[PDB]
Amino acid sequence: VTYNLEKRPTTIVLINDTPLNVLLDTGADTSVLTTAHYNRLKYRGRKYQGTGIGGVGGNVETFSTPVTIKKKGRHIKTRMLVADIPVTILGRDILQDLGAKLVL
Amino acid sequence: VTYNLEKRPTTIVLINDTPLNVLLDTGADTSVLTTAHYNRLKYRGRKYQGTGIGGVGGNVETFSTPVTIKKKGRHIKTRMLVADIPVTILGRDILQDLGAKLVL
Ligand SMILES: CC(C)[C@H](NC(=O)[C@H](Cc1cccc2ccccc12)CS(=O)(=O)C(C)(C)C)C(=O)N[C@H](CO)Cc1ccccc1
Numbered sequence: 001v002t003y004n005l006e007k008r009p010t011t012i013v014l015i016n017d018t019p020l021n022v023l024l025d026t027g028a029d030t031s032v033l034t035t036a037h038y039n040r041l042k043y044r045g046r047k048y049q050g051t052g053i054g055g056v057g058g059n060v061e062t063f064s065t066p067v068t069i070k071k072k073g074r075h076i077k078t079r080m081l082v083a084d085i086p087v088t089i090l091g092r093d094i095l096q097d098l099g100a101k102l103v104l
Numbered sequence: 105v106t107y108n109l110e111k112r113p114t115t116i117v118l119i120n121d122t123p124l125n126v127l128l129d130t131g132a133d134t135s136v137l138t139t140a141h142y143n144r145l146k147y148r149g150r151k152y153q154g155t156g157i158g159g160v161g162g163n164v165e166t167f168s169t170p171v172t173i174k175k176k177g178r179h180i181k182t183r184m185l186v187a188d189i190p191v192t193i194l195g196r197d198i199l200q201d202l203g204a205k206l207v208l
Protein backbone atom coordinates (compact mmCIF):
# COMPACT_ATOMS: atom_id res chain seq x y z
CA VAL A 1 0.00 0.00 0.00
CA THR A 2 0.94 3.59 -0.60
CA TYR A 3 0.82 6.44 1.91
CA ASN A 4 0.53 9.84 0.20
CA LEU A 5 1.23 11.67 3.46
CA GLU A 6 -2.02 13.64 3.71
CA LYS A 7 -2.32 11.90 7.10
CA ARG A 8 0.35 10.46 9.41
CA PRO A 9 1.33 7.07 7.93
CA THR A 10 0.10 4.62 10.53
CA THR A 11 -0.54 0.90 10.38
CA ILE A 12 -1.48 -1.96 12.68
CA VAL A 13 1.32 -4.47 13.37
CA LEU A 14 1.40 -7.41 15.82
CA ILE A 15 4.25 -7.00 18.35
CA ASN A 16 4.59 -10.06 20.67
CA ASP A 17 1.06 -11.03 19.61
CA THR A 18 -0.58 -7.72 20.45
CA PRO A 19 -2.10 -5.52 17.74
CA LEU A 20 -0.64 -2.00 18.02
CA ASN A 21 -1.07 1.15 15.82
CA VAL A 22 2.42 2.37 14.90
CA LEU A 23 3.86 5.40 13.05
CA LEU A 24 6.03 4.53 9.95
CA ASP A 25 8.89 6.97 10.36
CA THR A 26 11.66 7.55 7.85
CA GLY A 27 13.25 10.16 10.18
CA ALA A 28 13.83 7.60 13.02
CA ASP A 29 17.06 5.61 12.84
CA THR A 30 15.66 3.01 15.10
CA SER A 31 12.28 1.78 16.34
CA VAL A 32 10.83 2.66 19.75
CA LEU A 33 7.92 1.24 21.71
CA THR A 34 6.22 3.58 24.15
CA THR A 35 6.36 2.31 27.76
CA ALA A 36 2.48 2.20 27.89
CA HIS A 37 2.59 -0.20 24.88
CA TYR A 38 5.39 -2.36 26.47
CA ASN A 39 3.18 -2.71 29.57
CA ARG A 40 0.25 -3.90 27.46
CA LEU A 41 2.14 -6.58 25.46
CA LYS A 42 0.72 -10.12 25.95
CA TYR A 43 4.29 -11.37 26.37
CA ARG A 44 7.48 -9.48 27.24
CA GLY A 45 11.15 -10.61 27.18
CA ARG A 46 13.90 -9.15 29.37
CA LYS A 47 14.78 -5.48 29.55
CA TYR A 48 18.43 -4.55 28.66
CA GLN A 49 19.64 -1.11 29.79
CA GLY A 50 20.23 1.24 26.83
CA THR A 51 21.93 4.63 26.23
CA GLY A 52 19.00 6.75 24.98
CA ILE A 53 17.63 8.43 21.95
CA GLY A 54 17.88 12.10 20.87
CA GLY A 55 15.13 14.10 19.24
CA VAL A 56 13.69 17.54 19.10
CA GLY A 57 13.81 18.57 22.79
CA GLY A 58 16.84 16.58 23.99
CA ASN A 59 17.79 13.05 25.01
CA VAL A 60 15.57 10.50 26.71
CA GLU A 61 16.61 7.29 28.49
CA THR A 62 15.77 3.96 26.95
CA PHE A 63 15.91 0.26 27.63
CA SER A 64 15.90 -2.40 24.85
CA THR A 65 13.69 -5.53 24.76
CA PRO A 66 13.35 -8.56 22.40
CA VAL A 67 10.26 -8.60 20.24
CA THR A 68 8.68 -10.61 17.42
CA ILE A 69 6.87 -8.44 14.85
CA LYS A 70 4.38 -9.88 12.38
CA LYS A 71 3.18 -7.88 9.33
CA LYS A 72 2.95 -8.37 5.57
CA GLY A 73 3.24 -12.11 6.29
CA ARG A 74 6.80 -11.52 7.65
CA HIS A 75 8.08 -12.66 11.02
CA ILE A 76 10.78 -10.32 12.35
CA LYS A 77 12.65 -11.14 15.53
CA THR A 78 14.61 -8.15 16.77
CA ARG A 79 15.15 -5.75 19.66
CA MET A 80 13.14 -2.52 20.05
CA LEU A 81 13.94 0.37 22.38
CA VAL A 82 11.31 1.34 25.05
CA ALA A 83 10.87 5.03 26.10
CA ASP A 84 8.29 7.43 27.51
CA ILE A 85 7.40 8.93 24.12
CA PRO A 86 3.89 9.70 22.79
CA VAL A 87 3.70 7.09 20.05
CA THR A 88 5.27 3.78 19.00
CA ILE A 89 7.56 4.19 16.03
CA LEU A 90 8.81 1.80 13.43
CA GLY A 91 12.02 3.47 12.17
CA ARG A 92 14.45 2.58 9.37
CA ASP A 93 15.81 -0.59 10.94
CA ILE A 94 12.38 -2.28 10.83
CA LEU A 95 11.13 -0.46 7.72
CA GLN A 96 14.14 -1.89 5.77
CA ASP A 97 13.24 -5.35 7.06
CA LEU A 98 9.64 -4.95 5.85
CA GLY A 99 10.69 -3.72 2.37
CA ALA A 100 9.27 -0.16 2.83
CA LYS A 101 10.59 2.48 0.45
CA LEU A 102 10.16 6.26 0.19
CA VAL A 103 9.68 7.55 -3.38
CA LEU A 104 10.40 11.10 -4.30
CA VAL B 105 14.23 8.25 -6.96
CA THR B 106 13.73 5.60 -4.34
CA TYR B 107 15.18 5.55 -0.82
CA ASN B 108 15.40 2.02 0.58
CA LEU B 109 16.17 3.33 4.07
CA GLU B 110 19.58 1.70 4.53
CA LYS B 111 20.76 5.28 5.12
CA ARG B 112 18.86 8.36 6.33
CA PRO B 113 16.89 9.66 3.31
CA THR B 114 18.54 12.99 2.59
CA THR B 115 18.47 15.22 -0.45
CA ILE B 116 19.67 18.64 -1.55
CA VAL B 117 16.92 21.25 -2.02
CA LEU B 118 17.22 24.99 -2.74
CA ILE B 119 15.53 27.04 0.02
CA ASN B 120 15.53 30.82 -0.76
CA ASP B 121 18.27 30.11 -3.32
CA THR B 122 20.61 28.29 -0.96
CA PRO B 123 21.43 24.60 -1.45
CA LEU B 124 20.75 22.73 1.82
CA ASN B 125 20.89 18.97 2.71
CA VAL B 126 17.54 18.05 4.28
CA LEU B 127 16.06 14.94 5.94
CA LEU B 128 12.84 13.58 4.25
CA ASP B 129 10.74 12.73 7.28
CA THR B 130 7.40 10.95 7.20
CA GLY B 131 7.15 11.20 11.03
CA ALA B 132 7.19 15.08 11.00
CA ASP B 133 3.82 16.76 10.55
CA THR B 134 5.48 19.92 9.46
CA SER B 135 8.83 21.09 8.11
CA VAL B 136 11.50 22.79 10.23
CA LEU B 137 14.64 24.70 9.31
CA THR B 138 17.43 24.68 11.87
CA THR B 139 18.36 28.19 13.08
CA ALA B 140 21.96 27.74 11.73
CA HIS B 141 20.43 27.12 8.25
CA TYR B 142 18.04 30.16 8.56
CA ASN B 143 21.11 32.31 9.34
CA ARG B 144 22.89 31.07 6.21
CA LEU B 145 20.02 31.66 3.74
CA LYS B 146 20.92 34.12 0.93
CA TYR B 147 17.57 35.83 1.48
CA ARG B 148 15.23 35.74 4.49
CA GLY B 149 11.64 37.04 4.89
CA ARG B 150 10.09 38.13 8.19
CA LYS B 151 9.93 35.99 11.31
CA TYR B 152 6.40 35.31 12.74
CA GLN B 153 6.23 34.08 16.35
CA GLY B 154 5.04 30.45 16.56
CA THR B 155 3.81 28.06 19.30
CA GLY B 156 6.42 25.27 19.11
CA ILE B 157 6.91 21.71 18.11
CA GLY B 158 6.90 18.55 20.28
CA GLY B 159 9.19 15.59 19.85
CA VAL B 160 11.03 12.99 21.80
CA GLY B 161 12.37 15.05 24.74
CA GLY B 162 9.66 17.73 25.03
CA ASN B 163 8.57 20.96 23.35
CA VAL B 164 10.80 23.52 21.69
CA GLU B 165 9.93 27.11 20.73
CA THR B 166 9.64 28.03 17.09
CA PHE B 167 9.15 30.99 14.81
CA SER B 168 7.76 30.69 11.23
CA THR B 169 9.27 32.32 8.11
CA PRO B 170 8.29 32.52 4.39
CA VAL B 171 10.38 30.46 2.03
CA THR B 172 10.54 29.45 -1.64
CA ILE B 173 11.67 25.84 -2.16
CA LYS B 174 12.88 24.57 -5.52
CA LYS B 175 13.25 20.82 -6.24
CA LYS B 176 12.09 18.33 -8.87
CA GLY B 177 11.46 21.37 -11.09
CA ARG B 178 8.74 22.55 -8.64
CA HIS B 179 8.54 25.99 -7.07
CA ILE B 180 6.89 25.87 -3.64
CA LYS B 181 6.13 29.04 -1.75
CA THR B 182 5.23 28.31 1.85
CA ARG B 183 6.13 28.95 5.49
CA MET B 184 8.63 26.79 7.40
CA LEU B 185 9.17 26.73 11.15
CA VAL B 186 12.68 27.63 12.51
CA ALA B 187 14.05 25.91 15.68
CA ASP B 188 17.30 24.96 17.37
CA ILE B 189 17.20 21.33 16.20
CA PRO B 190 20.10 19.28 14.78
CA VAL B 191 18.91 18.95 11.20
CA THR B 192 16.56 20.61 8.69
CA ILE B 193 13.48 18.51 8.06
CA LEU B 194 11.04 18.37 5.22
CA GLY B 195 7.90 16.87 6.84
CA ARG B 196 4.54 15.79 5.39
CA ASP B 197 3.32 19.24 4.45
CA ILE B 198 6.17 19.72 1.95
CA LEU B 199 6.55 16.04 1.05
CA GLN B 200 2.86 16.02 -0.10
CA ASP B 201 3.58 19.10 -2.21
CA LEU B 202 6.56 17.36 -3.86
CA GLY B 203 4.57 14.17 -4.61
CA ALA B 204 6.62 11.94 -2.22
CA LYS B 205 5.00 8.67 -1.20
CA LEU B 206 5.92 5.92 1.27
CA VAL B 207 5.33 2.36 -0.02
CA LEU B 208 4.92 -0.53 2.32
C1 LIG C 1 12.11 9.11 17.41
C2 LIG C 1 13.65 9.12 17.43
C3 LIG C 1 14.26 7.72 17.24
C4 LIG C 1 14.23 10.01 16.31
N1 LIG C 1 15.67 10.34 16.47
C5 LIG C 1 16.67 9.73 15.78
O1 LIG C 1 16.47 8.85 14.92
C6 LIG C 1 18.09 10.26 16.06
C7 LIG C 1 18.42 11.19 14.87
C8 LIG C 1 19.45 12.25 15.30
C9 LIG C 1 19.72 12.58 16.58
C10 LIG C 1 20.69 13.62 16.87
C11 LIG C 1 21.33 14.27 15.86
C12 LIG C 1 21.05 13.95 14.49
C13 LIG C 1 21.75 14.65 13.44
C14 LIG C 1 21.48 14.35 12.13
C15 LIG C 1 20.52 13.35 11.80
C16 LIG C 1 19.85 12.66 12.82
C17 LIG C 1 20.12 12.96 14.16
C18 LIG C 1 19.15 9.12 16.21
S1 LIG C 1 19.16 8.48 17.87
O2 LIG C 1 19.76 9.51 18.67
O3 LIG C 1 17.88 7.97 18.26
C19 LIG C 1 20.30 7.03 17.84
C20 LIG C 1 20.42 6.58 19.32
C21 LIG C 1 19.68 5.85 17.06
C22 LIG C 1 21.68 7.46 17.28
C23 LIG C 1 13.54 11.43 16.23
O4 LIG C 1 12.98 12.00 17.16
N2 LIG C 1 13.57 11.96 14.95
C24 LIG C 1 13.01 13.28 14.62
C25 LIG C 1 11.97 13.05 13.49
O5 LIG C 1 12.74 12.47 12.38
C26 LIG C 1 14.17 14.19 14.15
C27 LIG C 1 15.14 14.77 15.16
C28 LIG C 1 16.38 14.19 15.47
C29 LIG C 1 17.29 14.77 16.36
C30 LIG C 1 16.94 15.97 16.98
C31 LIG C 1 15.73 16.59 16.68
C32 LIG C 1 14.84 15.99 15.78
Ligand SMILES: CC(C)[C@H](NC(=O)[C@H](Cc1cccc2ccccc12)CS(=O)(=O)C(C)(C)C)C(=O)N[C@H](CO)Cc1ccccc1
Pocket residue numbers: 008025027028055056085086087130131132133134135136156157158159160161193195
Ligand atom coordinates in the same frame (compact mmCIF):
# COMPACT_ATOMS: atom_id res chain seq x y z
C1 LIG D 1 10.55 17.03 14.07
C2 LIG D 1 9.13 17.29 14.62
C3 LIG D 1 8.28 18.18 13.69
C4 LIG D 1 8.35 15.97 14.82
N1 LIG D 1 7.13 16.11 15.65
C5 LIG D 1 5.87 16.16 15.15
O1 LIG D 1 5.62 16.08 13.94
C6 LIG D 1 4.74 16.25 16.20
C7 LIG D 1 4.17 14.81 16.31
C8 LIG D 1 3.54 14.60 17.70
C9 LIG D 1 3.79 15.37 18.78
C10 LIG D 1 3.16 15.06 20.05
C11 LIG D 1 2.33 13.99 20.16
C12 LIG D 1 2.05 13.14 19.03
C13 LIG D 1 1.16 12.03 19.17
C14 LIG D 1 0.91 11.22 18.10
C15 LIG D 1 1.52 11.47 16.84
C16 LIG D 1 2.37 12.57 16.69
C17 LIG D 1 2.64 13.40 17.78
C18 LIG D 1 3.63 17.28 15.81
S1 LIG D 1 4.10 18.93 16.31
O2 LIG D 1 3.99 18.93 17.74
O3 LIG D 1 5.33 19.35 15.72
C19 LIG D 1 2.80 20.04 15.63
C20 LIG D 1 3.12 21.44 16.20
C21 LIG D 1 2.90 20.14 14.08
C22 LIG D 1 1.40 19.57 16.09
C23 LIG D 1 9.19 14.87 15.59
O4 LIG D 1 10.12 15.09 16.34
N2 LIG D 1 8.80 13.59 15.25
C24 LIG D 1 9.42 12.38 15.83
C25 LIG D 1 9.96 11.54 14.64
O5 LIG D 1 8.77 11.22 13.83
C26 LIG D 1 8.33 11.63 16.62
C27 LIG D 1 7.88 12.15 17.97
C28 LIG D 1 6.75 12.95 18.15
C29 LIG D 1 6.32 13.38 19.41
C30 LIG D 1 7.04 12.99 20.54
C31 LIG D 1 8.16 12.17 20.40
C32 LIG D 1 8.58 11.75 19.13
